[PDB]
Write a protein that binds this ligand. Sequence first.
Ligand SMILES: Nc1ncnc2c1ncn2[C@@H]1O[C@H](COP(=O)(O)OP(=O)(O)OP(=O)(O)O)[C@@H](O)[C@H]1O
Ligand SMILES: Nc1ncnc2c1ncn2[C@@H]1O[C@H](COP(=O)(O)OP(=O)(O)OP(=O)(O)O)[C@@H](O)[C@H]1O
Ligand SMILES: [Mg+2]
Ligand SMILES: [Mg+2]
Lengths: 167, 370, 283, 38, 413, 377, 175, 144
Amino acid sequence: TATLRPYLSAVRATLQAALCLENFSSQVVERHNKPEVEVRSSKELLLQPVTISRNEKEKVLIEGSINSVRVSIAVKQADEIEKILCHKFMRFMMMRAENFFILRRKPVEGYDISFLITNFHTEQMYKHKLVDFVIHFMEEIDKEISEMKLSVNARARIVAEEFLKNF
Amino acid sequence: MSLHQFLLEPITCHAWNRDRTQIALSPNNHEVHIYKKNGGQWVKAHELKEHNGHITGIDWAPKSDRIVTCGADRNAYVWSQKDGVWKPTLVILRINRAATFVKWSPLENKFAVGSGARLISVCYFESENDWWVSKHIKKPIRSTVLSLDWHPNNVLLAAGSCDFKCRVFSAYIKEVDEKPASTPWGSKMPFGQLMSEFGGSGTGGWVHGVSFSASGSRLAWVSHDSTVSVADASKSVQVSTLKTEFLPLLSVSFVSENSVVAAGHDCCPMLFNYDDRGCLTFVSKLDIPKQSIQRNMSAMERFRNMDKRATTEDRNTALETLHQNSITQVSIYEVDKQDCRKFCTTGIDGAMTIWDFKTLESSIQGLRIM
Amino acid sequence: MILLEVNNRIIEETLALKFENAAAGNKPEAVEVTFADFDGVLYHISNPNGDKTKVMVSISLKFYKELQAHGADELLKRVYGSYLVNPESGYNVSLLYDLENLPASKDSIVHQAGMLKRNCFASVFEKYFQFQEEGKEGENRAVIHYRDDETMYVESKKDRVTVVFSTVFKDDDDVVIGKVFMQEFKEGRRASHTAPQVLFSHREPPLELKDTDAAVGDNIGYITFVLFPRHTNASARDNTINLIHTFRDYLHYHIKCSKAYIHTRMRAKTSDFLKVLNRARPD
Amino acid sequence: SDQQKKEELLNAMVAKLGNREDPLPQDSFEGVDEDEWD
Amino acid sequence: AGRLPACVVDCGTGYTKLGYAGNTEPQFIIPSCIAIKESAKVGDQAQRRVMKGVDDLDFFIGDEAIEKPTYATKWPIRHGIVEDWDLMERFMEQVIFKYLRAEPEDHYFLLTEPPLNTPENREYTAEIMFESFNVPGLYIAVQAVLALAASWTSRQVGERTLTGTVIDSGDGVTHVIPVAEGYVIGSCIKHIPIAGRDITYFIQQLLRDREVGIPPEQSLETAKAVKERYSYVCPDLVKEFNKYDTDGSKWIKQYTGINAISKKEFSIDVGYERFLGPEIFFHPEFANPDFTQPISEVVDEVIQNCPIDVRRPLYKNIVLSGGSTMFRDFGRRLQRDLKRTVDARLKLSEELSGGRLKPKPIDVQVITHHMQRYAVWFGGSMLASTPEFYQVCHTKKDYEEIGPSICRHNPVF
Amino acid sequence: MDSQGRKVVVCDNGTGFVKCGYAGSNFPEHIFPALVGRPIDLMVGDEASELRSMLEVNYPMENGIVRNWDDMKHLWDYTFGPEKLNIDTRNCKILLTEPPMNPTKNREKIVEVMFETYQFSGVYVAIQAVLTLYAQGLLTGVVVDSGDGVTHICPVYEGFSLPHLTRRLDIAGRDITRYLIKLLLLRGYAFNHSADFETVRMIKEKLCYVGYNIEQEQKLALETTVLVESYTLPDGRIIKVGGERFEAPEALFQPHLINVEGVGVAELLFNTIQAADIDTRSEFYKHIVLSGGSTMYPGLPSRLERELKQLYLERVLKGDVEKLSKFKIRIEDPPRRKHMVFLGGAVLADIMKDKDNFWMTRQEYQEKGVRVLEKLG
Amino acid sequence: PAYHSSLMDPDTKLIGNMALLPIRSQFKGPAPRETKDTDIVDEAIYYFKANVFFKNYEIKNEADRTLIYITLYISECLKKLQKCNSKSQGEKEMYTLGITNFPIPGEPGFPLNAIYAKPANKQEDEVMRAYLQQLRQETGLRLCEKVFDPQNDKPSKWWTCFVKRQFMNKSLSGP
Amino acid sequence: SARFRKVDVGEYDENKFVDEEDGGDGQAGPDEGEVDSCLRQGNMTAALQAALKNPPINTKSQAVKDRAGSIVLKVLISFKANDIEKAVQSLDKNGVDLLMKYIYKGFESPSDNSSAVLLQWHEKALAAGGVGSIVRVLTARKTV
Ligand SMILES: Nc1ncnc2c1ncn2[C@@H]1O[C@H](COP(=O)(O)OP(=O)(O)OP(=O)(O)O)[C@@H](O)[C@H]1O
Ligand SMILES: Nc1ncnc2c1ncn2[C@@H]1O[C@H](COP(=O)(O)OP(=O)(O)OP(=O)(O)O)[C@@H](O)[C@H]1O
Ligand SMILES: [Mg+2]
Ligand SMILES: [Mg+2]
C-alpha cells in the first residue's frame, strides 16, 4: 500500500524520458522502415535497458532505441486461482492484438505482457495519453482479478447450498 | 505568440520565400503544398507531386527563387517557375541509401545533401552539357548524417551525425568558387579536408542540430544527452558544455553574437547566454506560461491544489504550452542573423507559431536579450 | 436452470406426437431415430419389420453385465410388465408399444418411458438399502465401471451407507475450480443440519479403498457421500436415487458455466480499454 | 494433404447417397390447372 | 456404445435446427430468441447487474421465450451475422446441456456459417467452442456446398457434379450464390431484400384492409398460418381475377381461429391473398418502393458476370433451397422467365449478326428435390456420418500448439 | 542531323507500348498502345483504345516476337502515316530493337519487310541490353531482365553481346501473382483464379517486397503486428494482408515452392559469371544493371549481394574469412527506369550517324539479298 | 409487367396526345359510335384490378393516356361508393359526380403535367371537355352495375377493399 | 541446397561501428576502510561523500564494479528517512548523476526491504536533479 505510489511515480518518471522518438530509415537494407529494438542490426542506435522493482516478484523492464520502445510488465500473483485467472486474462487480451495497435502477440520470457511502441503511434496520438494509458492499465488489472475471484467464491457458495437443500 | 493551425497531420519541414508572403511545406506525404496569404487568411496556392517516397527536405533560395527537394526515394529535384507553373529537374546523386537533409549555399551556386550512406553530397551545375553533377565527402564519417550548416564565406561546412561527433569539413570546388582567404579554423583548404572534430569521450549522444554564428567564428550544437555545447575557434578552439535538466532538444539557432535559442521535446523554446570569458548559462524559457495561466490558476490555490493532487492525482487534459506536441524546426523570420526580432517555430501537432522579442521583453520581468 | 433433469426429451415428444396422432384415427407414419445421452448410452426408436402400427424403443449400455448380477431384470419386469419383450440385436433392453391397444391415460406411460436409464441404475441402491434395513453385515462392496476411467463404490454398514465416486478432471484449471467447489460442498453443512456428510480427497484414495487397485494420479479425485436412515427409508428413497446419480454432470456443468461467466466478464474491460485508447486521438 | 482426403471424401459422397422415386411434398397441395402451364 | 455420432447445429435468423448425425430429419426446430430477466433499470450499462448469486442462469430459450411475463425477449442474429456473443454463448449452454443432453468432451461438432464471413468471427466461434466447453473437434462448413450436395438425391449416378447456382431464401435476405468446382466465386454473390417476413406483412395489411373480426394481438400468427396453408403461384394475373369473380364457390376458402383471452371462435374468408402473396418475388415494387428488379434478371446478371468457360454448366444446374421456396409452381415460373430472357438475347444477337454467328441453344433446368426445407442440415448430416470425416476435422491439439489460426481456413469441400 | 538531310527515326516496339521519336531527343514524342480493333472497319493505335467496347481487340506481338504479320504491317503504316510522323519512307534512316535470344528467321523476315515493302534507306537492329548499357554510359556489364514472360541474364563485353553465355529462367510476375492467390486462399478469403487476376496484381504492385533475412521477418510476423496492412476491394470489403508480403516474391530464389525444378536467380548469375574467362571476371562483378518490370521490389539488390557473397565464400575461398574483404561487388539500379531503351537508341543514333559502316545499305540488299545480315557483327 | 391497350388503329383522330376512341353510350358527346362489342371502358374495368398495384408505368402509345385517366377516375368512383347503401341513390350520386368539373391538362390542378400535352386553342378545349365528361358519365354508369351485389343489395366487400390504393401515387381530386 | 545460407556475413563487414575505449584498468573503485570508519564513528554525510569517490568507469573487470556497488548499496540502506534530503542537497550535478546510476543499478537484485529505501532515494534525487539525469543514465556507453 505504502509502496504503490512511489512505484508508479518512478515508472511514470522513467517512461517520460524513454518516449522521445524520431523517424529513421534503415542503413542496412534500402527502402525499409523497421523497429530497431527488434532487428538489432546496428549497435549504436540502442539504449541501455532499465528495470524498476517493487519487491522480489513485481518488476517493469524498459528497453529503448532511436525509433521504438518495448515495455515488459510482471504481475503480482498470490496463489493458484489468481495465476490461472491472470493467464486466462493475458491470453484473452493477446489474442485481440490487432485492435490495440501497441500490443505484442507473445510476451518476453519471464514476464506476462509486453508493449511495443513505434514512432507512428506517437505521431498519431499524444505522448502523455499513452503514458496515462500504461499507468491506468497497471492500476486496473489487480482490481479486476480480485473482483473475479470474489465473484467465483460467491457463485460457488450459492450452488452448493442449492444442491444440498433438496436432498 | 501567434498560433495558426494549418492541418491535423504532422508537418515534416517548412520553408519561407524572400518577402515572407508565401510558405512551402510537406503534409507528411509525397507532395509539397505552397500556401499564399490573401487578406488575413491562408489559402492553398500550388501543389507539387513528383516523388515516390517520404519527403525529407525542402529548401527555398531567396534570390533566384528555386526550390530544392530531397526525399526517401534516393532522388532530388530542383523546381523553377515558368508562366505560373512549377517545373522540376532531376539531380543525379549516385547514392544507394535514403537522403536526410538539404541546404543551399549562401551564394546559391551549389547545395549540400546529407544522406544515410555515410557520405555528404555536394551538387553544382554544369552548363556545357546542362545537368547537375555531384561530388562526395566520405572519410571519416561512420554513421548517418543528421544536420548541416554553411559557413558565410561559402567554403566551409559543418556536420553532425550518429557517431557522437561534430565535424567541420572544407567543400571547395575549383570550377565554380574563387580563391578563399585565411580563417582561424585553418589555412590549407583542399576538397574534403577535415578541419576540426569535436565530441565527448565516453558519453554518447546523437547530434541533432548544428549552427554557425553571424561572424562565423563560433559554433553551437545540441545532443541527445541534454547537453548544449559552444565551440570558439579564436581562443585556441575551446569547447564549453552545459548539462541541462530537461528533455533533449532538436533544433538550434544563433540569433545574435552571444545568444542561443533552442527547442525540442519540452515543447517550448529556451534562451541561453554565452559571454566572452567562456561560461554558458541558462537564462529563461521564452514560452512563459500563457497569461500567467491566470496567476497560475491563483498561485496560493494551485499550491492547495497540489495538496489536492496529493489526495487525488489526476492528469492534465491539455498542456499549458502553445504546442501540444514536439517542436522540430526553429527559423529566423525577420531580417537575418545580424538583426533578429521575430522567429518562427513548427511542430508535430500541425501548427505554425510566430514569436516576437519585444513582447517577450515587455512581459517577462528582468529579461534582456542582446 | 441449476438442477439437471431426469427424464429425456426426444422420447417424450416423439411418443406424445405418435399417441396424439393415433388417438384421432389418422394414418400413421414411419420413424427411424438414433441418438445418445450422458455417460455413453445409446438409444434407438424404430418399427419392427416395417410395420407402421408398432413402435419399438431400445437402449444400449456397456456395463449391463454388472447391473444384471444385482438383479436389474426383476425391477424392470415389475415397473413395465407386458411392454418388456425380447431384446433387439446389438441392444440390451427393448420395449414395444402397439398403437391399437392404448389406454385412455397417456401421460404416465410416456413418463415411465422417459425414465428408462434411472430404472436401470436404481436396482443396486434398492438392493443395498435393504441390507442396512435388515441389519446385515459382511457383504461385499458394489463396484460399477460406469465410464472408462471412473468408478462408483457402494458399501453398507449398520447406520451408514457409503457411496464413493472416483472422477478425472481433464484440464489443469478444472482441478482448481473443482477444489473451490468441493471446499464449499465440505463446509456447506452450516445452514442445514439434516444434510448428508460429503468428504473430498485429492490425488490419493481414501483408507477403506486401500484393498482395491485404485488409481493414484494428479487429476484423480475421490468424493464420499454418507447416507443416514432418515434418507434411506421406504418413503424418501426416490428423490435420493434421483439426486445421487446425476452429481458428476451437475459438477462439470457448473464448472463450465463458471468459465463462461468469466469469459463474459472480460469483454467489458476490453471494450473500456479500447474506448480509453480511442479517446486519445486528436480527431 | 487436403486434396487426396477431399477426393476420397467426394468419392464417399458419390458412392453413399441413394435415390428416391416418391412423389414430392409439393404435389399434395392444391394449385392451378396443368394445361395452361406452357 | 463404441462410436458416438456427431452433433449438427444450424443457426439462423428465424429458426434453429439441431440434432444428431446420420438421420434424415432434425430432432428440434426452435425459434432463435432468448428471454432474460430485465428487472433492473432500463438503459444503464453501469447498473447492469453483477451476478452475486446465480442470476445469469435465469433465462429461457426457444418457444418458452415467446410471451413470458416479467421477461425481455432478445433476438441475437440480424441477417445471419451474430451481434451479441454473450447471448450466443448463453444460447449454446441451453442448447447443449438441456435439449441434446450430450457430454461435450465425447462428441465432435459441425457448425454452419454465413456466406460472407470474416475470419475473426471464425476465431471467436472457435474460442467459444474450445475454451468453454472443451470439445475434441470442430468443423465450420459452407452452406451452399451442403445444399448442392443435398440436391443429389433426385439425380442419377453419372451426373453428380459440384458446379451450380444456389438460390437461398429464408427470413432474412435472399442470396444468389454461384459455386464452381466446390469453391464459391465470392465476387458475384447478389442479394435481394425480400423474404418471408415481407410476405407475412403484406398478407397482414391485406387482411387488415378487407376482413373484420380478427383480434389485434393475433394478426401475425393468422397471416403466417394463411401463408403456410393456402398459397400458390399463378401464371397470369387478370385470368385469376376472372376466375375468382366468375366462380367464387371453388376458389374462396374459410379459416377458423380461436381467441386466446375469451376462448371464442372466429371465422374469416381467404380470397385474393392466396396468389398475391408470392407474386412480390416477381414484382418487388408492390411492397418495397426501392427495389424494382425481378429475381430472373438478378439470376441472369449473376451468371453473365461469371467467367466464360463455366457459363454453360451454371445454366444446367440451378438448385432451390430454403424454407421460403416451398410454394407450388416456383421453378416452372422461374424456368419460363429465364428461358424467355435467354432466347430474346440470342435472337437479338442472331439478328445483329446477320448470319455470321450461329450459337447453339442452351439448356436451362431448375431442380426441385425432396429435402428442400432442411437442405443444409441434411448435407451436414450426410457429411458427418462417413468415417472419412474424422481425418478432415480439426483437433484440440492443433488449437493448443498452433492456436486459433487453424479455424480461419477449413478444407473446402 | 546528317549531311544528306535524311532524318533518323528511333522506334521502340515494346509489348505494352510503342514509342517513337527522333535522334538526339531526350524524351519520346509519340506513345501508342499496340492494338488492332475490329467492329462487331479497322482502327489501329490510340483511337481503337478509347473506343474499346465496340471493337474486338487483338494484340499482334507476344513476348517481343511478332505473331501476326499483317497486324504489325498495319501498325507500321499507322506509325509512318501523316497523322503521327509524316515522314517519307524512301528518305529516312531507322533504328530498331530486338529481344534477346531471338530466332534468326524472325530477324530475316523483319529485315525483308523493312527493305522490300517500305524501301528504307538505312536499317539497323540492336539488342536491348547494349542499348541499356549505352543509356547508362557503360560498355561492359551483365544485364538482368525480368518482365512478364521469362527472366534473362545476358553479359555484354566491348559493346557486343556474348551469345553462348545468355541464360534463361522461367519465373516471372504471373507465377508470383498465382502464388499470392494461393496464399490469400489459405487465409480464408474467397478468390477465383480467372475472375480475380487484376485485383491481386494491383495488391502485388502496391504492397509486396523482398526480405533480407528470412528468420527475422518470420519472427516479426509471428511475434509483432507491425507488418499488417489493410486493402479495400472494389466491392467494398476490407481485407488485411500480413506476412504474405515477403512470402510471395520468395519464389524467385526458391523455385521449389511453385513446383518448378532448377536453381534460383543468384546461383544462375554466379554460374553465368564464373563460366566466363578468368581475366574479365573483375569487370563483370563491378557492373551489374537491373532492368524490367519485376525488378522494382524494395530490398532486391541487398539480398542479391548477400547471396552472391555467401556463394563466393562457400565455393571459391572454401571457408577463408580474411580474403572476403578483397571481394568487391556493386549492383546498380537506375532511378530513371521509364524510357531507357529509347534514350540508349537515341544516343546510339546520335553519335554513330555519319560513319559508313554502321548502316546497312539498300544497294547491298539489291546486290546480295539476305547476305547483308552477316555485317551486323 | 403492366398491361397496355391494343385498340390502336391509325385512322383514329387525336386531341393533342389523346386518342379519340369510339364509345357505346346514350349520353351526347363528340365521340364516334362503336360497332364492335369491346371498347376502352370495358378494357379499363378489365385491367383495373391488376393495374392498381403498379407504380412505374411506361407510355407506349396514345390510348394508354386515356386508359390511365379512366383508371384514375375509378378510384374516385369507389370512394363515393363506400358510403352508399342502396342502388338508386347510387346512380343519383354518380350522376352528380359526373356533372361536376375536374382540372383538365394544362391547368395546375392536373397531376401528370409532364407527360400530358397541353391543348392549343378554344374549340380543342371544348371538344376535350365534352369528351372527358362523356367518358366520365359512361364509366360511372358502367361501374354502377358491376360494384353492387344483387342478392343483398349492398356494396361488395371484394370491390370496396381497393379504396386506399393509388395508381402511381397520384390522385385526380388530390388532398 | 542451402548450406551457404547459414553463414552470417554481415558482421565481417569493415565499415561497421566499433566502440572506442580509453583508460586502463587501474581504477580500483572506492576504498572500504574510510567508509567503514565513517560508518563506525557515525558520520553519515562523510560516508556518503567518501563512498562516491573514484568511480570505476574504465575497468572492464566485473568484480571491481560489483564490490563498488556492494559498498555503495551498503551505505545507502543504513540511513534514516529524515536525513535523506540533507545528504542529497550537499552534492553537485555529477554526484546526482552518479547516485542515479547507482540507484538504477541497485534495482537489479532486490533483497529484503531495500526497494522502499531505493524508491525514497529515487524520489529525492528526481526532485533535486530533474528528468535529464535519467536521460544521461539511458545514453551512457560506459556503465558503473
Ligand atoms: N410452405 C411453407 N412451409 C414452411 N415454411 C414456409 C412455407 N412458406 C413460407 N415459409 C416460411 O419459411 C420460413 C422458414 O425459413 P428458414 O427456416 O429457411 O429460415 P432461416 O433460419 O433464416 O434459414 P437459413 O438457415 O436458410 O438462413 C418461415 O418464416 C416461414 O414463414
Ligand atoms: N512496381 C511494380 N512492382 C512489382 N511488379 C511490378 C511493378 N510494376 C509492374 N510490375 C509487374 O511487371 C510486369 C510488367 O513488366 P513490363 O512492363 O516490362 O512488361 P512487358 O513489356 O509486357 O514485358 P516483356 O517485355 O517481358 O514481354 C507485370 O507482371 C507487372 O505486374
Ligand atoms: Mg436465414
Ligand atoms: Mg517488358
